[PDB]
Amino acid sequence: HFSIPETESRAYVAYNIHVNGVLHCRVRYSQLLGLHEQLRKEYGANVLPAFPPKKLFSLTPAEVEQRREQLEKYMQAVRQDPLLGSSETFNSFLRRAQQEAH
Ligand code: NA
């Protein structure tokens, strides 16, 4: 359902969310972090899946790539959650970001 195949550049890294194998929306780590925090507020740190850590230096390809897997797993985990998957803040976030992909 949710997947993260490719990435991008320029200065920052972006993540191409594919819904059912087609492009869906493009987002950066800070945006997902923002999202995760809107969720932790309102639902509590319990219940929420684990979110990939901040970094203090720019990202090695291996890192970018690893952070890709972990954001991938995270989005799926939230979408699968009865409580989270149907949340307003999650779904509105999806809508806005999709509408954002030019
Ligand atoms: Na960022």
Residue 79, annotated ligand binder? no
Contacts of 98 (CB under 8 A, 6+ apart): 24, 25
The burial of 14, by beta-carbon neighbours within 10 Å (0-12 exposed, 13-18 middle, 19 or more buried), is given as middle
Q: Which domains does the chain have, with CATH numbers?
A: 1-102 (3.30.1520.10)
Residue 41, annotated ligand binder? no
Residue 3, annotated ligand binder? no
Q: Return the CA Rg of the chain.
A: 13
Q: What is the end-to-end Cα distance of the chain in Å, rounded?
A: 22
Instruction: Give the Å distance between the CA of 1 and the centre of ligand 1.
Output: 24
The burial of 4, by beta-carbon neighbours within 10 Å (0-12 exposed, 13-18 middle, 19 or more buried), is given as buried
Distance of alpha carbon 4 from alpha carbon 19, whole angstroms:
9
Instruction: Give the Å distance between the CA of 47 and the centre of ligand 1.
Output: 24
Instruction: Give this entry's resolution in angstroms.
Output: 2.8
